[PDB]
Design a protein around this ligand. Sequence first.
Ligand SMILES: Nc1ncnc2c1ncn2[C@@H]1O[C@H](COP(=O)(O)OP(=O)(O)OC[C@@H](O)[C@@H](O)[C@@H](O)CO)[C@@H](O)[C@H]1O
Length: 159
Amino acid sequence: APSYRVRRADISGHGEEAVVNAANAKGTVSDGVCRAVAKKWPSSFKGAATPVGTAKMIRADGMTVIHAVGPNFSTVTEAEGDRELAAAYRAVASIISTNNIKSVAVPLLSTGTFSGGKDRVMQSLNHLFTALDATDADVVIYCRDKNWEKKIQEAIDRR
Ligand SMILES: Nc1ncnc2c1ncn2[C@@H]1O[C@H](COP(=O)(O)OP(=O)(O)OC[C@@H](O)[C@@H](O)[C@@H](O)CO)[C@@H](O)[C@H]1O
């Protein structure tokens, strides 16, 4: 069974075997988790473009980077975005299990740039749990907000 922890830290400083980038479909560097991943593992972005609701893995810069593209909730209906967000996390879980990845640092997809201005911490976290429950990986969830950290810890504890 997987284990879940939360850290309030820059995800570029993670101590796991792999890191999930909250990516865009075009594989461009812009504000958010992506900028931190690009600074620490710059060559991880080569050929990283992948459609919304999918993930694409690369080994670069001594790191396994998994580019996962959550939906932009400004560009889909709520129900369409919920389906696509579930799909992005399942694509992450499939890459973790098929590549024997033992531990992974994960940000909450679609909770920042792609949130459509809504609080989606619980929506994103519930899809993260449902998908990564299919793996045996140690999962470390990364956030920057003290209230998010507590919410996430509370949700981990309830389990
Ligand atoms: N360094 C950091 N360490 C830990 N947590 C971090 C972080 N930088 C941002 N976060 C948080 O990670 C979540 C995803 O944000 P993001 O805004 O990065 O994630 P999405 O909402 O999925 O949007 C993706 C787009 O930003 C896309 O264009 C990419 O270029 C960018 O990622 C948000 O809750 C952010 O507050």
